[PDB]
Amino acid sequence: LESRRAAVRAWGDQPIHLADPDIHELMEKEKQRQVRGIELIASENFVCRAVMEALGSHLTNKYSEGMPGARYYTGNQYIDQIENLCIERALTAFGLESDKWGVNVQPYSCTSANFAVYTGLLLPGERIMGLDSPGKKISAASIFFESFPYKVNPQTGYIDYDKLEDKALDYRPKILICGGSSYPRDWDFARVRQIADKCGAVLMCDMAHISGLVATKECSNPFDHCDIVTSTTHKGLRGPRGGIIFYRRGPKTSTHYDLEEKINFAVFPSLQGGPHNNHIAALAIALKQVATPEYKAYIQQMKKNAQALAAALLRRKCRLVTGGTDNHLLLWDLTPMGLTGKVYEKVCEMCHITLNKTAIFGTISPGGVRIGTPAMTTRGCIESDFETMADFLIKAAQITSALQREHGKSHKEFVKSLCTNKDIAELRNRVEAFALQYEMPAS
Template identity: 55%
Template sequence: MSHWISSPGDEFKNTCLNVPLQKEDPEIYELIQKEKWRQYSCLELIASENFTSQAVMEANGSALTNKYSEGLPGARYYGGNEHIDVVENLCRTRALKAFQLKSEEWGVNVQPYSGTTANFSALTALLNPHDRIMGLELASGGHLTHGHQTAKKKISSSAIYFESFPYQVNPSTGLIDYDKLEAQADGYRPKLIICGASAYPRDWDYARLRAIADKHGAYLMADIAHISGLVAAGEQSSPFALCDIVTTTTHKTLRGPRAGLLFFHKGEKGTLRGDLEERCNFAVFPSNQGGPHNNTIAAVAVALKQVAEPSFKQYASQVRKNAKAVAETLQKHGYKLASGGTENHLVLWDLRPIGLNGNKMEKICDALNITVNKNSIAGDSSAFVPGGLRVGTAALTSRSFKEKDFVQVAEFLHQAAQLALKIQERSGSKLLKDFLAALEKDADVKALRVKVEQFAHQFPMPGFDPASVPESARHH
């Protein structure tokens, strides 16, 4: 009967609950390794992406993922949150510090799962159903959550539950048309004006927007998801002095994990801003979310600690210099850029004058291991065939790219565009499927891809050591 005798831990050791991923699920492990190698081997130019640190990833993959903690620190609906409360409070303190905010004037909810949920929680806090909002339209560089709808369909929940009247950039300059915005607001009388964008290469005139909002007793909300790292580092204007609500993601220029923050101004009771703290916190939970993701909140806290360091200011400054290098190099080749250049981390490249569209340019870049995304340009007739390409510099700047390196990146983009034009002509068709068929066989594309990968491999990789990726994951 001796085979029945065992120590208390033996049975546990034989379950899947304490087995490393590589052994427990080799399939998922291998896919993660392949993705690591892809990130290391490609030129990551998607403006909404970045490479976060090893410390952030360790916090995000920690045992904090096990804990339920509905409610706010000190007022949870579950027990056992003594350490979680400290983590969340630390994250809130660091969020205010990152943007040089005084706790008596501003508060922040760090629980939103994403920028989208932060935005909808802000709208839930500020508005009643069918209240009127104005945000930058999608084709002008705005975001889905700022009230996007088409002539036939309300797309975003912000358009489904509220009445949306978007404002635009001037199609000839690519800049926000503040005069037209004011005239539209005079007729529409919105309850909320949203400023912020996902593809606008310029800074914002918050004072002008505040004046327009005050004219109609409206709230002013800034969504700084794309530029928050630049705002924290003083590389873009800060909206905090003039806005009622500020939202952001945490993974773009802030270089943290994927999550959202909702900042609210603490006004005097009985004023327009008087009860925003209570309303915003209630909107996040219980209105729009369940329990917060404590592992991610801890990872956000780590990223915000890094934002406060001098090296982050240098990083943010380099992001802007690199974007300018891309813009100037593309312009030297005669290409047109929306707004004529950039003041932040991205360039919006108008491909229409050379007879290309964003779909084809994105696809050829994918084939070259250059990761970018197609993007609408003001004046586009169809969102399904956008006329532009959005190019961001935050991720590769995290890999120590400087201006001269981004000049080379822009040269690769120029070569990609010229190849795309040749392939489009050879395919004898404007259809994407014919372009892809011709692209697949092109020897020049394959040769340029090798050069791109060799170039990418010269630079360090944040968060993990590429040498640790097994050989099996390094093949396409």
């Protein structure tokens, strides 16, 4: 008996560094990469320990198909209380009342969440209209429904609400979507509502890129005008990877809102199985923390940092789409320096700087890069720190011009050159040195 009891404990309580050294080594190398590098991907962020402790818990052991108080399986009395608590905290986070709004927190991702709304509200093939980043059908939404997307004014970079109104009145989509893409300026949610109303569409906002700013009233509030708001749990909110759906409830021929039953059912049982109980606990923790002054200050600093960085790059002759930002992210046009994002991205990578090329405009040039403050803001960077980072971003560009010039016609021989360049190796060292000056949550 006691022999078997020890056999279980042996296996069950064996640490990762013993149970799987090969993985453990890779995890440690990746932890080091994270610490010794700058993170400028506007998506990315760093989570606190408590969120990781929630993820890495016995909650993964319990299958909980269904909703709180209406599960497929017995034993969910404590998982219900967690999900419920997670819900309550989601409303309070966005200053919502339970009589006017409900929320489903099971969606495996933001993509997943959006598609559930469409699945729930629409018959297959019905029409939707949302923003777009400039076989041939890519998103599942565009496969299983009829997506006619809209785009930003190619000259201004801003949204043209007038063309949008024309377009929407003509296409009469069942669902109109705002948010979605990485847009560096505030939305006129009020306006989009007027449009939605005119063409008899349901207004949805995908607030993934602004979840942080919305909760902290540091941008326009879509909850004031949309019938549905989806989001990512892990960007602004520094929660775990997943999605979430807010919908209206109770009164507005239609007497009351019809959303809750349809959406809940679409998530489960239509599209998903059980939820990730561990993700939900993690999410509740993250959402408790969003409702704090500490988090408000975090977002405020995030935005000050973004202006600091914008100002820095304009001072250095750079071209920003719209000439700046209202929020936490920058679209930087490199074509005036004669660079594509594709290559600048890959040089920055060699120098421990992570960013990502983006689509920019009146043809579609491959010469944009997308940058955001949240990650380094989380590591305690302030306005002067971002002024430093700017210098690194310019040195990287100066190198990139210099290398394209010497290697004018080498597709293979260019990637090799990278690994033995002295100016890269110098900048990489400056970046690692810089990076180590800032703390890294949960070590």
